[model samples]
Target: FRTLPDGVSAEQFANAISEFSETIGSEYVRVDEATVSEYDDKFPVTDGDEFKGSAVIWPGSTEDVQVIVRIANKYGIPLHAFSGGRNLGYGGSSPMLTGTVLLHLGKRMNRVLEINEKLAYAVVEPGVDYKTLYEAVRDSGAKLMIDPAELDWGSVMGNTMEHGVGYTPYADHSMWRCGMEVVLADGEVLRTGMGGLPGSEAWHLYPGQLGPSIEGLFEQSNFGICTRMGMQLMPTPPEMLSFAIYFENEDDLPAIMETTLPLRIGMAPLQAAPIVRNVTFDAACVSKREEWQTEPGPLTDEAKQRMVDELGIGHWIVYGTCYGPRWQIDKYIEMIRDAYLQIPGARFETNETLPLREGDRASELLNARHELNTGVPNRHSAAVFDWFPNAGHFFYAPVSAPSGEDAAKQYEDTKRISDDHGIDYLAQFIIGLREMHHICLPLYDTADPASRKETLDMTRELIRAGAEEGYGIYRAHNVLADQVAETYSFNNHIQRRSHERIKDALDPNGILNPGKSGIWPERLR
Candidate 1:
């Protein structure tokens, strides 16, 4: 059932894999369907074969990657590279061009090359996951903690290159990434930022420092494969205090966000941008939709009101934390609490006071977001998908202004669209200083094609609606990669054209990922 690209022949495909095995050891090469099945997108919304990986190739070092790339160039083969494919919802290590591509999984290359305690920087291979780095720093007594995204089982370099977010000041995963090493299609390996400069002390200390700062080159594109990445680890907060603020009305969301933004100024000791979630999302953390209404048309207002009554969490929940001196934590807490208390029917509860395990509310609240606050990597967030049977999710991340008004408007628009499509709206906003990622996940029952199709249709409507309002998608699953890329048609598609030029130059033969993020090579162009 495996297929190759249009021009690639079966003989040529077999030989390419042969060379790959010879180059990186036969044991490291996987062709059996059972072996490669694990590499398939664990969470797929589409019934199409967009995620079928023919062979999985694992390499253990920078040299191994170089060798594999050189062979790929020699054979004129398209190779799909992913640092770690643990988080398969975003297509994982699946090749954008099915069957025609060979998957290179970087998990075998896992290593913690450097962790500077004094400078607070870490140099690691693309395969390093958050838990590995977190444990290493802890065991070393480095006094540093990682800023992990929701699921920490993913690759550090892969997530950072995708500009993923976390729950710390170092949440700007891309900005914190400095030194980087990448291998182009032509077997050329180069380090970016100060990493290229010989014996540079500030390689990992700062970001790009040369003629053209192209550190963002290999990210979400088919230009090259990122092998090594350096990131500045965040210094652990002296004291961490988290608090939850509740508001009765959805209209109060704007007030909550507007008041939270100003507190991020002048590098405030705030650990992360405050987050706000609808009661539906918060409720799902504790129980499933079936508990409320299994045969769903719409999650009735009566049900929501009943939930609010049962949980006493109100219609909306806003939470913030600070990491610094106890005095500083108290200051941020006082200021944030005092401001949000302006809303009617608002209540505040501290993490210390918020009991755990004694009550259902305590456990549910803890389940929904405990590890997030502590930067501990866990699959706890997976419980969110428990709301639907055979659940599959996609993070529709669209950027918006840092305003509760903006968030409220965006939520209404998405809610309307999802309502029309008859899909539940699992929407939440991950706020930042200047902008926020309105993370909307359309949950569907993968066992039922009707639900899956509805979820897909809902996303198309949501994406178009957001684009009309000038909201840009930050990142997306490969299923919607092309659609998302096409929306950025600014100035007669100059940005896309620019990407094409790089795609043509870096991969002249179109031997890298062909249709990733909609940036096709020139021959195909």
Candidate 2:
């Protein structure tokens, strides 16, 4: 319902959008204010109060998406692509540059094209989520290992494209990606990896090295729209185990990282406390509105001590399945237990008997202590909704420090920067024992202006510090568009050069997601 600015008229825009939508099917296109508002709400926006945008286009298939992209390119309009739009605290569902048409891909293109059990990979379109894939595999009776996110409804392609982490050995979702089917700015279709070869059925298996592997080019870049991608899945273990440990002191954090990183026994063993708290508090095990109020005031010494006494000082929960036979699971458990006990104050409780039936149910058992006040089991505790309505806050930072001493210094420096800006510092070891680390989140009142500003400032400071220390943010929220891009000294220059060359060669009119990721045509300047 919102009219286009200046030279463009609502009627003209409607006609073009309608024509494109009609090709896909009328139901696939949304132009009304109500629909647009819904799309707006889906996007991740920093200043939600003042954020505004243009119309939204929902394409039903990869073909439909290509058609829309072609039209946008011809018309010189920007298109911001997204799936699930649950990427909150980062860039939610909104685009950085305004007046861009939101291309919502999840509605129509949610399909699993193929699953090769022998190859241990599945090919899927953008809209296919983990839940969908899990159900598909289960229904097919295929034994596949699932690298689950905190919640199960998020898109697998979206997660991979955004580089989302999962709680499995193959959990670095992006790392498992094989080939990609992308639509360039000019709507030219291209295949990466083995797909690049004509009539190659080994697209998934031979994903790289045959020629220039273009798959890596599209990731975290706005060069093209990832319509479909192939990902390798882990084999389901014969026997599995899941458990969590509680720590007594915040000081034990460095020790915890040291102990856990080396083992790599479980699929994933990263710090999971913030995620646990978000799932618990947002789901409102006690009260919804009251829980928000409990976050602001500083933790009193008595309260902190009581927390330490009850749950341990700085609680860290790690969960994952152990594969192989029962003996293998037991061996892993013993090795993990011994390593954990190395820290003087560290203590743990084990749940070796838990089965890997369903991720939704498993998530509940994983967070039982965090979600419920009473440790005693109750049937009502089975309510899965208690874990629903959760959102993740993530920021990728670097870790150059090789030894524990250097890591300790980096942690202190980073924590000091966060505290000085009034932000809570919660860290996660994403690459495990690898040299790099990414912070999980700092759960603050995002709706509060002061708190939000503080978070923003703290994030910028962290990025700056990381850069000063000869490291850079791997990825960042779209809200920090300038900051995220600026982290690399040559990013702007290189991106501009590449974008200009590509735009001129493929999209002379400068159409396509025009300003998506801030890669604009030089001629426009």
Candidate 3:
């Protein structure tokens, strides 16, 4: 039973609460422990020890959301919005600050508003995950392409908004989000792209008009609430092929990138680092789900070593998919096979058809499911851990260089810094070429104070290297707020200026997610 702050009457807050309860059935609205617990379980903290929050708000519709936003604005309460709460590494479901109202949007708003088959686009609410959309398209007999993520359970809208990538021609999910329906800080509704104009179906077609396209504004910003959005879907391919290439050494990675980037034959050609010690530990050292549930103690060192020997380290795997008619898939397969032969001691494996159609090869291995399946004994299914335990990791700043050589240098420099600290460094190539990459999943036991200090130091070193290389991190955890502020000085400026304008114009009382995206009452004061 929490009450609004000074200057806000209890009666006024009560009326707003009543309105929200009436709008979206009261069962959906919960501030109680049991209800909050349900929301918390699905969206657990990546760093549980560091997480803190007050209440939870579950909104069913755009109208309900608007009402909630309005109340928060009136009461000067901070709010954090979450779709599936599956945003793992980067702060999970909890907000950066404590005592913020967690707005959970994965409930009744889950629906495919419309699927325009002719145009190859679909409009959906935030709660509609990839699995839901995939099933809908299959049931409707529509030829829709799916650029699925590692986990199909993640929300389509949520992923797109966060600039998530997939494994198809339309793999770049953000590019597909043509238009957005957002609720601003003050509870004012706004639409972007051609949808912004009155009576226009052409928004999806013409995303950028004469004036500045506001679609980019909503991303990585706290100025508004995302209600609904429209995105283009790739047409289902008549034939598709997926396969993997395995290599022994890290040196082959550069050669692989050179060969694949030019051809662009596959939608996504992802390179896995040399799976040495830690990766082997993740796979073989871990206990089976059944064993873990049944057994009491942690894994023994001898058991872990045995598993490591079985699954030898340094096996780098690269998986990709080729889409076309049967003849084209065959032709591309030949081309890829030839490329694999060029690299000495490299082995190639091909699944000549779509895994979905033929149950012979599971798609789990190709996706992030590899992490879960490889670790779990005798289980084909993958299960991702909520957070990286006791690891201090940093994302590589987004670097856009003309050639791969520049990217290679950046990787070397960053890895050197990590090596200096005796850390096993790794990077992931996102967006077709080497346009954006993430240096993630660094592991160290936080229980030991010395190891924890070293991990934090390495994180700082990596951040410095990224900034020196003229790139800035897209997002950061609360611990690295100062680093993020210094790296993206321009972003901080823009955020400050925009927040001041919006707070005065929209919510004059200085409410509505009070300190989100680096904007807070303290800063303004």
lDDT of 1 by residue, 1-525 (tens): 365666678898789888888888999888888877777776677786666777778888778878888887777777788887765456766777777455555658788889999999888887788888888887888888787877768778888877777776777888888888888888788888788889998878877585888887777788888878888888777877777777888778787777767766544644577678788777777778877676678777777777777887878887666778798888878877777788888988777767565566844574335456666676656666788777767667799778677888998888788788777766677658777778787667767778768877888778898899899996777788788889999897788889999899888888787878788888787
List candidate 1 stretches off by more than 4 Å. Answer: 102-104, 265-271, 363-370
Per-residue lDDT value at 396 in model 2: 45
In order of lDDT, best first, we have 1, 2, 3
Per-residue error at 506 for model 1, in Å? 1.2
Best by lDDT: 1
Instruction: Give one clash count per candidate, in the order shown.
Output: 1, 8, 0
The Cα error of candidate 1 at residue 35, in Å, is: 1.8
The order of the candidates by TM-score, greatest first, is 1, 2, 3
Q: Which candidate number maximizes TM-score?
A: 1
List TM-score per model, in order: 0.95, 0.82, 0.77
* Global Cα lDDT for candidate 2: 0.59
Q: Which model is ahead, 1 or 2, in terms of lDDT?
A: 1
lDDT of 3 by residue, 119-228 (tens): 88888888888878777776777787656555667788888866776656666678888888888777878888788778998766667766887777666556677888
* Candidate 3 local Cα displacement, residue 168, angstroms: 1.1
- State model 3's lDDT: 0.57
Question: Candidate 1's error at 104, in angstroms?
Answer: 4.1
Model 3 misses residue 443 by how many Å? 4.7
